[PDB]
Design an enzyme around this catalytic site. Structure first.
Site, PDB file in Angstrom:
ATOM      1  CG  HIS A  42      -0.334   0.370   2.377  1.00 13.78           C
ATOM      2  ND1 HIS A  42      -0.825   1.339   3.400  1.00 13.78           N
ATOM      3  CD2 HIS A  42       0.966   0.120   2.917  1.00 13.78           C
ATOM      4  CE1 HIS A  42      -0.156   1.266   4.333  1.00 13.78           C
ATOM      5  NE2 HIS A  42       0.990   0.699   4.219  1.00 13.78           N
ATOM      6  CB  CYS A  96       2.630   3.624   6.410  1.00 11.87           C
ATOM      7  SG  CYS A  96       2.813   1.934   7.172  1.00 11.87           S
ATOM      8  CD  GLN A 114      -7.239   1.422   9.744  1.00 11.23           C
ATOM      9  OE1 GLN A 114      -7.041   2.464  10.568  1.00 11.23           O
ATOM     10  NE2 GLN A 114      -6.672   1.493   8.512  1.00 11.23           N
ATOM     11  CB  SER A 137      -4.391   4.973   9.003  1.00 13.82           C
ATOM     12  OG  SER A 137      -4.507   4.044   9.894  1.00 13.82           O
ATOM     13  CG  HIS A 140      -4.842   2.940   2.824  1.00 13.45           C
ATOM     14  ND1 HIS A 140      -5.794   3.522   3.894  1.00 13.45           N
ATOM     15  CD2 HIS A 140      -3.704   2.401   3.546  1.00 13.45           C
ATOM     16  CE1 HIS A 140      -5.297   3.438   5.104  1.00 13.45           C
ATOM     17  NE2 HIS A 140      -3.991   2.646   5.065  1.00 13.45           N
TER      18      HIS A 140
END
Length: 146
Positions: A42, A96, A114, A137, A140
């Site tokens: 991702h 990330c 998630q 978060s 993505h």
């Protein structure tokens, strides 16, 4: 007909039929064509409403959600046009530390990620890529690799 999540639509500009997926937010002109585990990469763009608005690239994430969507939208454009590899963009710009693995997250079953991330990953077929996927978060781009 059409795999799970896939729908058919019409361009307002040209009238040409296209296909898109509600679970992944993918879209394409071509007609599309469940495992225990999937492996995905991702690229995450965080925003000021992410659960933890901080990443290895930026101590305090200030950009807006709409600003994060525009970066994600531009990165998908770069990927689909072949200007940039997915792995190169994740390594550089993903908010990330999965960026160290070129975006790789490993394999996972349901019940870990998630939920909107999980639903998108399991709706992708191997080799397919998502559109923007919204989670707590941030936003993505998901690439299913196994």
């Amino acid at each position: 007909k059409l795999p799970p999540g896939w729908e058919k639509a019409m361009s307002r500009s040209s009238g040409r039929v296209y296909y898109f997926n509600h679970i992944t937010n993918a879209s394409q002109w071509e007609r599309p064509s469940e495992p225990a585990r999937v492996r995905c990469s991702h690229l995450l763009v965080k925003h000021s409403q992410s659960r933890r608005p901080s990443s290895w690239r930026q101590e305090k994430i200030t950009r807006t959600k709409e600003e994060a969507l525009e970066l994600i939208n531009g990165y998908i454009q770069k990927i689909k046009s072949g200007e940039e590899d997915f792995e190169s963009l994740a390594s550089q710009f993903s908010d990330c530390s999965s960026a160290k693995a070129r975006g790789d997250l490993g394999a996972f079953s349901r019940g870990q990620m998630q939920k909107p991330f999980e639903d998108a990953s399991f709706a992708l077929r191997t080799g397919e890529m998502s559109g923007p996927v919204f989670t707590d978060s941030g936003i993505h781009i998901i690439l299913r690799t196994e």
